[PDB]
Design a protein around this ligand. Sequence first.
Ligand SMILES: FCOC(C(F)(F)F)C(F)(F)F
Ligand SMILES: FCOC(C(F)(F)F)C(F)(F)F
Ligand SMILES: FCOC(C(F)(F)F)C(F)(F)F
Ligand SMILES: FCOC(C(F)(F)F)C(F)(F)F
Lengths: 253, 253, 253, 253
Amino acid sequence: SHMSRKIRDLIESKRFQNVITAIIVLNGAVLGLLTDTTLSASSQNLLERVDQLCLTIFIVEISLKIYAYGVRGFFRSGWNLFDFVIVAIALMTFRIFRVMRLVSVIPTMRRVVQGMLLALPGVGSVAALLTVVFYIAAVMATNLYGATFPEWFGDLSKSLYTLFQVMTLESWSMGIVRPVMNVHPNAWVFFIPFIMLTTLTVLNLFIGIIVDAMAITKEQEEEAKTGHHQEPISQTLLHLGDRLDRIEKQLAQ
Amino acid sequence: SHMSRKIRDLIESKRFQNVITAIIVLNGAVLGLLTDTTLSASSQNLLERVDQLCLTIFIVEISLKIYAYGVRGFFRSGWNLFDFVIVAIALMTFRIFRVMRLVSVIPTMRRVVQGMLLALPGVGSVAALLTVVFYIAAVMATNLYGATFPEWFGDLSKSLYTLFQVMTLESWSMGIVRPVMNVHPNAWVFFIPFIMLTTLTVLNLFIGIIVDAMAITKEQEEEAKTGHHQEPISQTLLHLGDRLDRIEKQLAQ
Amino acid sequence: SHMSRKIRDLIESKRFQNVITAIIVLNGAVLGLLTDTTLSASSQNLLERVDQLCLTIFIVEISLKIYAYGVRGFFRSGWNLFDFVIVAIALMTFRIFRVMRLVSVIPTMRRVVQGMLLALPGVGSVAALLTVVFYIAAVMATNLYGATFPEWFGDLSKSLYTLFQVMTLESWSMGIVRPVMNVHPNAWVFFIPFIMLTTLTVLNLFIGIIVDAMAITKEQEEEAKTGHHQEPISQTLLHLGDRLDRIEKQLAQ
Amino acid sequence: SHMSRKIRDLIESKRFQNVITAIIVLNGAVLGLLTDTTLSASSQNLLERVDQLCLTIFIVEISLKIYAYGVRGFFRSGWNLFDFVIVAIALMTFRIFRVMRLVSVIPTMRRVVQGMLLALPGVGSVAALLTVVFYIAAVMATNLYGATFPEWFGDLSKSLYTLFQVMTLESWSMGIVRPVMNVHPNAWVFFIPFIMLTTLTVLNLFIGIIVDAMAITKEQEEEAKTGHHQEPISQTLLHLGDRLDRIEKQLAQ
Ligand SMILES: FCOC(C(F)(F)F)C(F)(F)F
Ligand SMILES: FCOC(C(F)(F)F)C(F)(F)F
Ligand SMILES: FCOC(C(F)(F)F)C(F)(F)F
Ligand SMILES: FCOC(C(F)(F)F)C(F)(F)F
């Protein structure tokens, strides 16, 4: 109980964070050195020991945490969970994902990610509309072009892949649409509207995420530093209205 | 009259919407399975029955609607009409367009689309300017390059297609402009200004649609949930001016 | 003097504008039909008469204008001048530029263009910075790569062209930078920073034009329709401060 | 002391600035003429004298400055330092960088750059997140594809280069991902999420820089011209609250 408190004070320490950071980076650097195919077996052996170590430190850390907060207190945070899964999973193939923990552990990084996650609900409808345009476009392109262009359109999967490439504008004309039009001369009537509508919609999607993510992140940075945020101008004005109701009611008296 | 009301209450139900949704998706999934060229004839036969069914359910739905609102009440909504045409047309070649009904039937999706449609008027002039730049650029490119580069510029249609590809930046240089400059060394004086002006204008077009669409959609989401929207800060301030005129007029008294 | 006034009333008419519009479009459509290389000589002859006619109507129009406003009144407008040059020039090679007159004659189109022109001053410094980055990058790329890659970098002109292509991201890697790195393995140290800095700066340029152009255009549309614009919230608030100074000064009394 | 003041008045002069500008441009134009490989040795000799001259003028300038402000006063400005290094370095290989001095010497250009530098801190976390996604993606692509695609993925450096090309969307599909999928058919499960996440994040990075840079630059342009800036609407409203507290406190009296 005094122990809990002294440990929670270690954990919530800034030096302790710096140390977990340093270990994430180290574990990351070593997984990077291990991509190098030319390494001696002793080189690889060291590196792989450096990694067992990193992972052991994380076990202690997570222990120090589940303890100083209890099972239900730790698992109350999605970040703790994420930290827990990522570390636990290594105890049972892309280990480099452990480097994501730079996000869970560094607060300003965590707040960028939380802004983005929190913005996802409010673009869900733009994303659904994009999804529907894709699905429809892919069925039509399969039926229209699948028999004459089967590597690009031969089945629904192929069509979706190709249309995604088309929406990114990558070789959409020299590589896809001009060859298509040599066999189907009006194919531009399909492809040009597809491009116009998906590029508009995907930028609508991007801009909505970003504008909202940034506003959320900024409120969170405010709360984290002063315990509150700026009131919306919206509600500042309403309050000004209140002081003017209590002046018109004191002026009638 | 009590029937009408009990049916309108079915139709406007949330369970009924969920069911029409489920049928759109089903009809959609089956039109997707039917792109698959390898299907047995019995497989295709089933799928095609699953589709007759979906379309029959939509007939009933639309019936339940034209009735519970009458001919003129139903046809008062552009969405009802859209629903009606799309379903009626199937009763007389891209049937997959029926999946658009996910937009007409799901309200938050409908509001995204309405925001976009409603924003179109206020960019009509940017779009016209883009149209004029294209038309002019295509006439000039036809006259300048049509004889030496006829696959890309040989007629007005070819020129427009090529210029659209150029504005999207797709192979504009390695694939179009460098080959053009080997014959017409100053062609960069045409193509580089075209690119600068159309990319600026089309992004002006995109940003205007999106900024307006989003503001409209957000007002509509507000009205749908509370029957009104936020007053513009603009007009909140004017009202503050009013309470200050009735305080300066009570203070002169 | 009464004539002047009755003519100025014709000119400023909405039917007269519709008629000049109709003639611009006609002249435009015919210059378009004339790109078609397959035309009979009689077909071309007609079309070319349709064009002499269009241009004659414009002479009358401009006459009706220089008269009903006098030499100095007409030439007081940049649009009148533009109209005058474009029409006069045809009386002494890209005639299709006459279609620009759709912009000079249609007011909502004119206001889009005026917004863009008026926004140019306030991005002049971002544009200059882009210009400087290009100039410097092109000198360095010429010296670094000109001897080994002379078609892309062999002189300053070649370098600028190539770098413009690189900033648009068009084949920048498969077509330019990977071949360059086969001879100069660290060339990515030049090209990747160039891309990062020019794409950031050119989007800064684009966004500044567009945000300002749109705000200006919107003020102009306001003035054109009601003779004034919205006061900036900025100055609305200052005025609110004024009414509160005359309430604190009446409250001290 | 009177000398200092009369020299500081020269230096801070508008004619003196115009003259340093003119010399930067000249030095720049000559370094440009010197890229031209065809020059006579006498042509190159002149040009190289024109450059010694330019650099001498800059020595005097910098002297006139270090003097009229003293060692610690001059070196108090990052721009003076930059000017000093750039000029001093030439006294000990990309000399064309001297043209950057157009930025240090022209104030509206300096303010664009200061806005951008000052905005960098507040996107540091978005940039770090992009850095982490890249690092992780490059380790995984090396392990997944390095043995079968070693020119693109054969080591970490190769992977990062390729992924940067992929994020710019340049030939990402016809040139990289389709060839990859012929050997590793599910590679789209890696590449398409990479593209979606990096393009979203890099645009978040770009938009944050630009929005902040522009706001900072605009405040700086305000201060430079009137010695102060616009107060944030934020704080204008708070002040309005103050005058309403001194009216409710005078109205209770
Ligand atoms: F070598 C490691 O550095 C990386 C990481 F993740 F390991 F820390 C990074 F920071 F660049 F991303
Ligand atoms: F298989 C069907 O799913 C699609 C649709 F339209 F049919 F519902 C979608 F939702 F993904 F778009
Ligand atoms: F055939 C003519 O139509 C064109 C123009 F300019 F001539 F009017 C346009 F409107 F599309 F641009
Ligand atoms: F020839 C010189 O002109 C250039 C510079 F930098 F030298 F001044 C520029 F202005 F275009 F960039």
